[PDB]
Design a protein around this ligand. Structure first.
Ligand SMILES: *[C@@H]1O[C@H](CO)[C@@H](O)[C@H](O)[C@H]1NC(C)=O
Ligand SMILES: *[C@@H]1O[C@H](CO)[C@@H](O)[C@H](O)[C@H]1NC(C)=O
Lengths: 50, 49
């Protein structure tokens, strides 16, 4: 069972930049104007995403 | 209340204007207890008791 799906024109890859996307909420604790340090996984401040 | 997934109010270090996590949630104020020390004023045992 083989399906022939070939592409004659392939679009070249591009680079997408992002500033402030990818910072979630691991904890459900509210913080009414307090400064706290986090240690989790995040997307960088400046980078290129596929 | 402000937003659903976070409701525990606290502003500086210890005020913690909430309780823990009620089903009705929402936050009003803080007044568990607050009282201080005491000192004694004396004029002198050989002067008065
Ligand atoms: C019971 O839960 C409901 C939420 O639907 C709300 O009225 C309150 O948080 C609780 N207490 C009473 C008396 O309803
Ligand atoms: C207290 O006062 C009296 C009179 O002023 C004095 O004789 C005495 O030495 C003082 N001290 C004591 C411990 O009584």
């Amino acid at each position: 069972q083989c399906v022939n799906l070939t592409t004659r024109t392939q679009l070249p890859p591009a680079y997408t930049n992002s500033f402030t996307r990818g910072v979630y909420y691991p904890d459900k604790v509210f913080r009414s104007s307090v400064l706290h340090s986090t240690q989790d996984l995040f997307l960088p401040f400046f980078s290129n995403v596929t | 209340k402000f937003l659903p997934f976070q409701q525990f109010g606290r502003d500086i270090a210890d005020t913690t204007d909430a309780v823990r996590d009620p089903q009705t949630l929402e936050i009003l104020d803080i007044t568990p207890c607050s009282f201080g020390g005491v000192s004694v004023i004396t004029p002198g045992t050989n002067t008065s008791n």
